[PDB]
Amino acid sequence: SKLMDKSDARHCTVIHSMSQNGWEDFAEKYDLDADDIPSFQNPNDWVFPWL
Amino acid sequence: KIAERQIKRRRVYKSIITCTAVLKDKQLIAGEHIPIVPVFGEWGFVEDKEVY
Amino acid sequence: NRLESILSRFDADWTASDEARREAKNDLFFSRVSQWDDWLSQYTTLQYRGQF
């Protein structure tokens, strides 16, 4: 894509990070199997020592 | 007397007390609230403890 | 049961927001009680600690 509004882009990927209860909520909303825990490329790092 | 009804209201009682006995117990006060009116400055709560 | 689910959700939220709540509680203590957040060395030795 060579436009600021990204209108030339023919695809886009949005990464969703959600807590466990958020995972069951998402699975119920989209009719997914909550047992199979998903995984993807991790958008955020652990540079800060979060608990 | 048409009928009777139950109405919820607040009553203020004053009791003059000492460290050893109560001289006056539950004297009904006219007002519906505690008559003392507090005036505060930089009021607030920090750790569930009043700080003004 | 209900108790386990409620406690799990509360623990998840508490662990997620622990750092934010600690920082905000420090802000409240600093701006309301005192600016010397010294809990250990406050008793080791008596030295002048101004509040300007």
Swiss-Prot record, chain A:
Shown residues within the full chain? 162 to 212 of 725
Q: List the disulfide bonds.
A: none
Task: Give the UniProt family note.
Answer: Belongs to the p22likevirus portal protein family.
Assembly? Homododecamer. Interacts with the terminase large subunit; this interaction allows the packaging of viral DNA. Interacts (via C-terminus) with the head-to-tail adapter protein gp4; this interaction participates in the head completion. Interacts with the scaffolding protein; this interaction initiates procapsid assembly, thereby ensuring incorporation of only one portal ring per capsid. Interacts with the capsid protein.
Stated name of the protein: Portal protein
Compartment(s)? Virion
Q: Main role?
A: Forms the portal vertex of the capsid. This portal plays critical roles in head assembly, genome packaging, neck/tail attachment, and genome ejection. Procapsid assembly may initiate with a nucleation complex composed of portal and scaffolding proteins. The portal protein multimerizes as a single ring-shaped homododecamer arranged around a central channel. Switches upon genome packaging from an asymmetrical conformation in the procapsid (PC-portal) to a symmetrical ring in the mature capsid (MV-portal). This change of conformation may serve as a signal for headful packaging.
